[PDB]
Design a protein around this ligand. Structure first.
Ligand SMILES: Cc1cc2nc3c(=O)[nH]c(=O)nc-3n(C[C@H](O)[C@H](O)[C@H](O)COP(=O)(O)OP(=O)(O)OC[C@H]3O[C@@H](n4cnc5c(N)ncnc54)[C@H](O)[C@@H]3O)c2cc1C
Ligand code: HEM
Ligand SMILES: Cc1cc2nc3c(=O)[nH]c(=O)nc-3n(C[C@H](O)[C@H](O)[C@H](O)COP(=O)(O)O)c2cc1C
Length: 814
């Protein structure tokens, strides 16, 4: 096409297929990689990326490459050196080979970087964009086929810790590519050079392949088991889940096994009710276009044309899938919906594990609420074996006890860079004023000083904050539970080969754990109610706690209405159920960890390099349980008056256009104005530096002009200085009919289309507002369909392409 990204994708169409159909890459896809060939490719890649990043550093400020300089996010030389130390020993510097094809690739890289830097992009595209696509699956295939540690050693090349969303980053990178100004002949040369890079990788792969030359029912009867967990896996995740599930059985009073469904005629599911309290679990991954894993093909086909009566069979299904595919969890959903059709009854609800988000967290939640449901369905209420052992340290020095820090001991006092999720920096609160003018809600503007923390950030990045629970809650819990909160203790995992030795930093006090390490605020899960049922004296409340552990039946109605919908925290449950008198160590073992909370940075590092601004609305509501609930992070921050806040910075892909002349169309109702402030600041700064700045359009939305008009004075000043071109504010509560930002976009349709089509503008959408992103999206669909004559399909394809080129960025949350 005309934009460089689309031209590069279209030009390299055939060579990408040829590269991924090379014998080595095909064997890699099928899990047949072997250790020697992997060492070969990794050493070759070490040489290749060394040369590539050498030339990148050489031309990092040449205008023909400058917009593509992403060392913190993309560079691989360090991870490749780690992997060389792993795969070739401590003296890898002289032990790694240097094959002729690798030298050919390195020579081409050096020629480009030395005499034709305008082509260097074509090589980066060929490598980095490829690493951010298939790589994530290849790492898994590497982990299982070669049995590497789960800690990631040897596969550091496949890990990008500074890219939390490779799709959005690829969009940003395509955007940075299209900014490169070049003549059409140069564009054609660049596409041909991308073809050349693909061919170099292809012949490298070819050369490296030239250097290589009994029924389970009676089985469970003779082994004495009542649980079996079939896993449908291809890269080992469902296998791991099924193995952990069967492992919990022995540690729950029951007895289970994880088996491969391939070499078993599942017609033995009719023979399964002949085992006392038998239940079968299926951990099913789905591949292709809703196709089963190969190891489960015989299973899947069997459920096609069959009529085996499965009456009295107990089953449960957990699916492994990805929401980006349009056949989400087809295999798990099919197994679940089909086992009940043959007569079996569901014990626990079908789990839908998403791989786009945190699949591990979804599975942990599913298992945590699954085991109590089984124990309540079968009636084997024997109360399960614990997992953490209490050890009281009655005499111990204080310099050895965790006092609330997150990483190493005394890491909050001995603060040394780098600062990240495991070592947050304690920033001093310099400002904490009120932006809201009325009294509906409290909306605040905080400022955190990060002077000598060596922390970098850009407009659009996020800042995460570790809060602390309200001390009154902790004291009330310690009172009503009748225990001493200042008891220094520890909880040790007696699962000796599980390196998760503690539920939180230990040794520490119960007060510190309740304040900094635990949640004690969100509605409790099923597992904690089940494990607390054994501590209720009255049989009414004990039976309530037991019934709430059942996913099926009027227990779920009790659990959802009285706990979730009513928003009862742990203290409210201990209050309304006075029979509950459990110990405090078991409670600290059962409660989930306190999560950090993210906020869109509301400042530009080019004008506020030593400060991070936050714009947040305080959470405070009247729960349906009578009590008034407060948000942890927002209340904790509201109390901060100029006072340290443990925070760190997470990189996002929300970025202003590289060219200052490019216009921006920002849309952010309410708190979604947070990052745009920074944008505007930086934009204003670029005008003050004497640079030519394009149009800057803001579409903000609030209720009343005198209630929650955030940054009214600052935005007005920005507008009158010329920095903010248009201030289009939609007030949703000022007449009979409500007005949202969608209507203001619909109004300026013509100018917006001239900005998008002729000016090549960037569109931004941000905020909490529910169902707002799709409304803005449909509005842009209609604008593009109207002015630039198009069918609706052509317009939605135009907008999706803009999203691909990194011109339509979203940063929504909840
Ligand atoms: C990338 C990202 C960026 C973000 N940027 C911002 C930002 O710029 N500004 C900002 O303010 N927030 C932002 N957030 C959201 C923020 O992280 C928190 O979700 C929010 O600030 C509240 O945190 P909290 O700890 O105070 O409340 P929590 O302790 O976490 O409790 C919140 C829960 O309370 C419940 N709840 C809330 N209101 C009610 C109600 N009337 N009735 C019943 N239940 C209710 C809800 O179930 C809600 O989930 C962002 C989130 C992400 C992921
Ligand atoms: C194991 C074999 C491979 C498979 C299955 C594979 C698969 C894919 C897929 C599905 C995409 C599209 C992702 C997206 O559009 O966001 C992609 C993109 C890409 N792949 Fe790979 N790939 C493989 C190997 C390679 C190799 C060897 C290279 C070159 C060294 C490469 C370079 C790229 C590039 C440049 C893109 C980006 C295309 C674009 O969007 O412009 N891939 N790959
Ligand atoms: C080629 C391929 C196709 C996939 N197709 C789907 C799909 O159609 N639907 C879905 O929900 N997930 C799909 N996934 C996501 C997988 O189900 C997910 O990665 C799962 O965790 C794999 O589990 P495993 O490691 O045990 O094989 C697909 C993954 C790959 C690699």
């Amino acid at each position: 096409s005309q934009d460089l990204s689309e031209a590069l994708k279209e030009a390299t169409k055939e060579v990408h297929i040829r590269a991924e159909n090379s014998e080595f890459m095909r064997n890699f896809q099928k899990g047949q990689v072997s250790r020697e060939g992997f060492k070969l490719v990794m050493a070759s890649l070490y040489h290749i990326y060394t040369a590539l990043e050498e030339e990148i550093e050489r031309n990092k400020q040449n205008p023909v490459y400058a917009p593509l300089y992403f060392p913190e996010e993309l560079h691989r030389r360090a991870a490749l050196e780690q992997d060389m130390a792993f795969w070739y020993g401590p003296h890898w510097q002289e032990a790694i080979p240097y094959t002729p094809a690798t030298q050919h690739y390195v020579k081409r890289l050096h020629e480009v970087g030395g005499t034709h830097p305008e082509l260097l992009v074509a090589h980066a595209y060929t490598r980095y964009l490829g690493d951010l696509s298939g790589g994530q699956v290849l790492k898994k295939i590497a982990q299982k086929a070669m049995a590497l540690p789960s800690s990631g050693e040897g596969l550091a090349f496949f890990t990008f810790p500074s890219i939390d969303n490779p799709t959005k980053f690829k969009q940003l990178y395509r955007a940075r590519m299209n900014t490169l100004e070049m003549t059409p002949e140069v564009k054609h040369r660049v596409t041909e050079e991308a073809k050349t890079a693909f061919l170099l990788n292809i012949e490298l792969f070819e050369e490296l392949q030239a250097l290589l030359p009994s029924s389970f029912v009676e089985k469970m009867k003779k082994t004495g088991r009542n649980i079996i967990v079939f896993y449908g896996s291809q890269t080992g995740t469902a296998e791991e889940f099924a193995n952990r599930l069967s492992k919990d059985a022995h540690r729950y009073g029951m007895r289970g096994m994880s088996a491969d469904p391939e070499e078993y005629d599942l017609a033995d599911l009719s023979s399964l009710p002949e085992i006392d309290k038998s239940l079968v679990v299926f951990c099913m991954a789905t591949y292709g276009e809703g196709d089963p894993t190969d190891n489960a093909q015989d299973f899947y086909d069997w459920l096609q044309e069959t009529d085996v009566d499965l009456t009295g069979v107990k089953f449960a299904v957990f699916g492994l899938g990805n929401k980006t595919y349009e056949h989400f969890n087809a295999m798990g959903k099919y197994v679940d919906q089909r086992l009940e059709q043959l007569g079996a009854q569901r014990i626990f609800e079908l789990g839908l594990g998403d791989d786009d988000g945190n699949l591990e967290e979804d599975f942990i939640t599913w298992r945590e609420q699954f085991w109590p449901a089984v124990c309540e369905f079968f009636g084997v209420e024997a109360s399960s074996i614990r997992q953490y052992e209490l050890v009281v340290h009655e005499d111990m020095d204080v310099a050895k006890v965790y006092t609330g820090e997150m990483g190493r001991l005394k890491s909050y006092e001995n603060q040394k860079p780098p600062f990240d999720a495991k070592n947050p920096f304690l920033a001093a609160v310099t400002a904490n004023r009120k932006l809201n003018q009325g009294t509906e809600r409290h909306l605040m503007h905080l400022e955190l000083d990060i002077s000598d923390s060596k922390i970098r950030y850009e407009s659009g990045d996020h800042v995460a904050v570790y809060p602390a629970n309200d001390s009154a809650l902790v004291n009330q819990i310690g009172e009503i539970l009748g225990a001493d909160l200042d008891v220094i203790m520890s909880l040790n995992n007696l699962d000796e080969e599980s390196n998760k030795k503690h539920p939180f930093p230990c040794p520490t006090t119960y007060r510190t754990a309740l304040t900094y390490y635990l949640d004690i605020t969100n509605p409790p899960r099923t597992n904690v109610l089940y494990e607390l049922a054994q501590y209720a004296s009255e049989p009414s409340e004990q039976e309530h706690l037991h019934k709430m552990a059942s996913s099926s039946g009027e227990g779920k109605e009790l659990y959802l209405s009285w706990v979730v919908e009513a928003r009862r925290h742990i203290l409210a449950i201990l209050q309304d159920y006075p029979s509950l008198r459990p110990p405090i160590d078991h409670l600290c073992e059962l409660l989930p960890r306190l999560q950090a909370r993210y906020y869109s940075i509301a400042s530009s590092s080019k004008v506020h390099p030593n400060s991070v601004h936050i714009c947040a609305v305080a959470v405070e509501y009247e729960a349906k349980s009578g009590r008034v609930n407060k948000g942890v992070a927002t209340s904790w921050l509201r109390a901060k008056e100029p006072a340290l806040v443990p925070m760190f910075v997470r990189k996002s892909q929300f970025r202003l256009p590289f060219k200052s002349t490019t216009p921006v169309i920002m849309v952010g109702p309410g708190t979604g104005i947070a990052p745009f402030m920074g944008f505007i600041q930086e934009r204003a700064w670029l005008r003050e530096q004497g640079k030519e700045v394009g149009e800057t359009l803001l579409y903000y939305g609030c209720r009343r002009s005198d209630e929650d008009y955030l940054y009214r004075e600052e935005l007005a000043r920005f507008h009158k200085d010329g920095a903010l071109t248009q201030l289009n504010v939609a007030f949703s509560r000022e007449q009979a009919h409500k007005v949202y930002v969608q209507h203001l976009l619909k109004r300026d349709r013509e100018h917006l289309w001239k900005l998008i089509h002729e000016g090549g503008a960037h569109i931004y959408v941000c905020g909490d507002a529910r169902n707002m992103a799709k409304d803005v999206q449909n509005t842009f669909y209609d604008i593009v369909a109207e002015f630039g004559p198009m069918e609706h399909t052509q317009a939605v394809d135009y907008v999706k392409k803009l999203m691909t080129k990194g011109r339509y960025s979203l940063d929504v949350w909840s």
